[PDB]
Design a protein around this ligand. Structure first.
Ligand code: W0S
Length: 166
């Protein structure tokens, strides 16, 4: 059955004030079926508030739209973000990896969410022993947004806790 609507929505900031429901739809329909498409407007003046949202039929379509950034809509580069679960960060905390998880375990798993720039496996300041958690920094926030909405992360056979960092 259908993924929850919240996970199929993209909020689009930075719109041209000339963008309409129709022009936003014509743009974003290139990456999937849109079940909803709205430009937010002032209730009295009807002047655009400069943001809106689109709702796709599937999560894979959201992924396709995000992978097609940057989006220039009606002459202006816009800022799409998945709806909140916005705390826009590029770094995650990964906990529960114990002492046998290495850099390549984290890279092999997380590289499929986005381009990794830093992997930091935490070690004890005094002894050098692994503390059982790590931080991963990506080149872009959408990787993190995809990661933190998953119910489960299994890395090196460990069930991990993953959260947005800083
Ligand atoms: C003004 O822009 C945004 C508005 C909302 C409203 N929920 C959410 C957003 O991101 C999830 C935005 O940034 C694109």
């Amino acid at each position: 059955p259908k993924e929850p609507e919240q996970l199929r929505k993209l909020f689009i900031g930075g719109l041209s004030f000339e963008t309409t429901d129709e022009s936003l739809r014509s743009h974003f329909e290139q990456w999937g079926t849109l079940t909803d498409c709205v430009v937010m407007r002032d209730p009295n003046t009807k002047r655009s508030r400069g943001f809106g949202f689109v709702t796709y039929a599937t999560v894979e379509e959201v992924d396709a739209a995000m992978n097609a950034r940057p989006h220039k809509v009606d002459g202006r580069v816009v800022e799409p973000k998945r709806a909140v679960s916005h705390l826009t960060v590029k770094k995650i905390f990964v906990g529960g990896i114990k002492e046998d998880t290495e850099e390549h375990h984290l890279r092999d798993y997380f590289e499929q969410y986005g381009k990794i720039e830093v992997i930091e496996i935490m070690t004890d300041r005094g002894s050098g022993k692994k503390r059982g958690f790590a931080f991963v920094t990506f080149d872009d926030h959408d990787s993190v947004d995809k990661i933190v909405i998953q119910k489960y992360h299994t890395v090196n056979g460990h069930n991990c806790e993953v959260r947005k960092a800083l």
